[PDB]
TrEMBL record:
UniProt entry keywords in alphabetical sequence: Coiled coil, Plasmid
Residue ranges that the Swiss-Prot or TrEMBL entry lists as coiled coil: 4-38, 171-198
Signal peptide per UniProt: none
Name under which the protein is recorded: Surface protein
Amino acid sequence: IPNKQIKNKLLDDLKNLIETANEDRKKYEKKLEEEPSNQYGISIFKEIYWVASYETVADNTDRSKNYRKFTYATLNPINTNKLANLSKILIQSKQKTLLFGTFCNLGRTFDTAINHLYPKKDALDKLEISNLEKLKNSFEKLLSMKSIVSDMLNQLLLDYQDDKDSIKTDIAKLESHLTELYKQIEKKSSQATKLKNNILSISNL
Ligand SMILES: N[C@@H](CCC(=O)N[C@@H](CS)C(=O)NCC(=O)O)C(=O)O
């Protein structure tokens, strides 16, 4: 009830969300630094081209390296040794450029929100209870959009291995499944853009 305790509970929660989210970032940065030659078997990177170029997302450029890093943010919880199998399923996606586009976007949107908040994680007390709450619910939701995307792609590995809905034995069903997945993830991506923006809006600091 007394506002000091409310305010401080919120500074506690933001503190913990911000460090948990920083651990995730230290982890996908490290996933890039230790990326082997074959990019964990994600051969789809080679098939994805910048806008009017022969440069792929597999090449050794800053923008290419960042695209794969943000993709590894989104895929961060999947076991590294399953990414080859994940890429084999997705190669069959009719919208893999767009799909991978959204992986990059969730990663980047995420990365921007934590890069903005990490340096301020101990000095959020200048905000007022209303828009400290909005900050916390916004960021926690952002973490959530990206987590769900990770769960969805993890689940696809098991469903495909199980032949669920005949996804393994029927290519047409695999395709519409993958298409539906891309719509789901695309919403999560749009929704993640709004929340990075909300967050940047109310935490100038
Ligand atoms: N449209 C690109 C992806 C664009 C996108 O939304 N992703 C972000 C992060 S991976 C991005 O392009 N960042 C690279 C940049 O902004 O230079 C695609 O279709 O594959």
